[PDB]
Write an enzyme that holds these catalytic residues in place. Sequence first.
Site, short mmCIF file in Angstrom:
data_model
loop_
_atom_site.label_atom_id
_atom_site.label_comp_id
_atom_site.label_asym_id
_atom_site.label_seq_id
_atom_site.Cartn_x
_atom_site.Cartn_y
_atom_site.Cartn_z
N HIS B 55 33.37 70.24 27.98
CA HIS B 55 34.02 70.70 26.76
C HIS B 55 35.53 70.74 27.02
CE1 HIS B 55 30.51 72.67 24.38
NE2 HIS B 55 30.19 71.48 24.85
N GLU B 57 37.66 73.17 26.72
CA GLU B 57 38.09 74.33 27.49
C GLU B 57 37.75 74.21 28.95
OE1 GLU B 57 36.49 74.13 24.44
OE2 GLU B 57 35.97 76.20 23.90
N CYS B 85 32.57 78.16 22.59
CA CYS B 85 31.13 78.30 22.53
C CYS B 85 30.72 79.24 23.71
CB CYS B 85 30.49 76.91 22.67
SG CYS B 85 30.49 76.28 24.38
ZN LIG Z 1 32.40 74.96 24.75
#
Ligand SMILES: [Zn+2]
EC number: 3.5.4.3
Lengths: 155, 158
Positions: B55, B57, B85
Site C-alpha cells: 500500500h 503508506e 486501512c
Molecule cells: Zn492500507
Amino acid sequence: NHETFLKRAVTLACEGVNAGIGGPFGAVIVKDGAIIAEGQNNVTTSNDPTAHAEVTAIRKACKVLGAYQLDDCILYTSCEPCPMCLGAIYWARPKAVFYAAEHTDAAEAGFDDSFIYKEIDKPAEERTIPFYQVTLTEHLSPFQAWRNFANKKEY
Amino acid sequence: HAMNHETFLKRAVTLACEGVNAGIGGPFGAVIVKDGAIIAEGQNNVTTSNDPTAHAEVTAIRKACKVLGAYQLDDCILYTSCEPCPMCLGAIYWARPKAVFYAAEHTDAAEAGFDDSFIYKEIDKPAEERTIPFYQVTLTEHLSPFQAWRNFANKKEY
Ligand SMILES: [Zn+2]
Ligand SMILES: [Zn+2]
C-alpha cells in the site's frame, strides 16, 4: 498436518529470537500440502517495522507464486496476527489462518499488539498517534483516475 | 512558499492519481515529512510488485526507514491520500511517526470498490466466524518464543 505446520511456525519464532534475527514470531504459508514460504520477524535487522513474520511470509509466498493473492493457501502463525498482519491477510486473501498464541501473550511479552487493537476503537484525534482528516476539494480525484484507467488490475 | 498540511496532502493525492495513470497500482499515495521536508514518497504498487502489503503508506514507511537507517519514524509526520486501512494503521503504530493526516476516508475507498471498510468490520467478528477464518490451536510450546525473547540478552525491542 495443521498441527505440524503450526509447530514449525513456533520453532521458527524461537529460532528467530535465538539467532538475533528479530522478534518471537514465525509464520508458514502452505498450498497443496507444501510450504511455499516461511517468515520470521525481522524488523530490527532489516530496518523495516512492517517486517513481521506474517508480512514477510506473505511477501515471499507472493514472489514464489508470481501473484499478489494467496489463492488456496493457508497461513500458520505462531501468534494471533496483530492489526497490521490481520490487514495484510485480508489483502492477500489466503483461505484460512491458524495460530497458536494470542494477542495477549504478545502484549505480556512487551509488544504493542493489544494496544493497537484498542487504538482502532479510539476517536481518530484522541489516538496516541493522532489521525487528522483534512478536507481537500480533489480528494476523490484518484478514484476518478482509477475508474477511467482501462488497464487496471483490481486487488 | 509557506507549507501547510494541505500542501503535503495534495502531493499525496497527486501521487495517487499519477500512480494509477502510470500503471503502478491503486489510487493511493503517501508522503513522509521530517523537518518540514518530504523524505519519502509511496504509491500503491500491489499488482506491479506482486505484494499485497505494498500500500502507499507501507511503501512510504519502508522507504523512509531505509533513508533514515532506522526501524522507527522519529519526529516524522505521515500524509496519505486516503485514511489508512487496518493494515496501514497497524504499520503506522509499529513505525511510530508523530501524527497522520489524511484526505479521503475509508468510506470513499469502499465506494470505489476496495475492502478497507470491510476489513475494519472483520476485526470485530469472532475469529472463527470471519470470512477468512482464524482458528486458534492450543500447543503446549506456544509460549516458548516469548520465553526465548525474555531470556535473549541482546534483544532489540520494537
Ligand atoms: Zn492500507
Ligand atoms: Zn504483525
